[PDB]
Design a protein around this ligand. Structure first.
Ligand SMILES: N=C(N)NNC(=O)Nc1c(F)cc(S(=O)(=O)Nc2scnc2C(=O)O)cc1F
Ligand SMILES: [Zn+2]
Ligand SMILES: [Zn+2]
Ligand SMILES: [Zn+2]
Length: 232
């Protein structure tokens, strides 16, 4: 029903069922005096679970595993980090200690290493060129090109028409650019156009942060990125 917001979430994680065998995970971090939520994805893979992204640090990620263990009761066997920043790889060591196989593209592993971030163990091949797609159990992984980061992936759940954009897609309430230090502002709209052209059938679109919507989130993101590009 109601999507969890910061008001409903203290170190804690809430799960939200989007569709059959598909959940978002919602966590929060305090940064620079503000509290910001973050979304990831949980996709049932027969009798196991695939996790998309950490819950933004070690404590949140241990809370995530505890909240999955309580509310779903199926083992997380694999996790994918959609880019090298801490809201995506922070907590990878926690997952690994729990016997989760952690995965990222070689691009993400290299950038995580340069940044001194946690490094997922396993390499995702076949994603190095813009518009590359690879199947990963119950999802398709898609490299749309540089956007929020040079390595960002998006995740589609063909069975449920759920598109998880991670930090490449903004929620409607975000009307100004977020962390764009590692962004390719010049390529971001082209990368969104690749997502639009590949998943024109998506019914649910989950941004990296805040409320889900539909494919209008992609145009929304294009509008915000263009407005930032044109700052005088
Ligand atoms: N906007 C520039 N140029 N660079 N920004 C920064 O160096 N730092 C920074 C920033 F500007 C903005 C944010 S943010 O607004 O909280 N965005 C965040 S926090 C976790 N994920 C994101 C995101 O946008 O996906 C976090 C940051 F660490
Ligand atoms: Zn990021
Ligand atoms: Zn392994
Ligand atoms: Zn982010």
């Amino acid at each position: 029903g109601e999507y969890p917001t910061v008001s409903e979430i203290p170190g804690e994680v809430r799960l939200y069922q989007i569709a059959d065998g598909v959940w978002s995970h919602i966590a929060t971090q305090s940064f620079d005096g503000a509290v910001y939520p973050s979304n990831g994805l949980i996709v049932r893979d027969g009798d196991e679970l695939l996790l998309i992204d950490t819950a933004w640090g070690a404590k949140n990620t241990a809370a995530l595993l505890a909240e999955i263990e309580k509310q779903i009761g199926l083992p997380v066997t694999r996790a994918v980090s959609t880019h090298f920043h801490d809201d995506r790889v922070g907590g990878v060591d926690v997952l690994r200690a729990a016997g989760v196989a952690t995965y990222a593209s070689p691009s993400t592993r290299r950038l995580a290493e340069v940044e001194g971030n946690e490094i997922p163990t396993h390499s995702l091949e076949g994603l190095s060129s813009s518009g590359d797609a690879v199947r990963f159990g119950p999802v398709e992984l898609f490299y749309p090109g540089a956007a929020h980061s040079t390595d960002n992936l998006v995740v589609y759940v063909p069975s449920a028409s759920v598109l998880y954009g991670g930090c490449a897609i903004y929620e409607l309430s975000r009307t100004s650019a977020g962390n764009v230090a590692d962004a390719d502002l010049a390529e971001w709209p082209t990368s969104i156009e690749r997502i639009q052209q590949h998943y024109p059938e998506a019914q649910f679109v989950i941004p990296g942060h805040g409320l889900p919507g539909g494919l209008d989130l992609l145009k929304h993101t294009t509008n915000v990125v263009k407005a930032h590009t044109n700052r005088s």
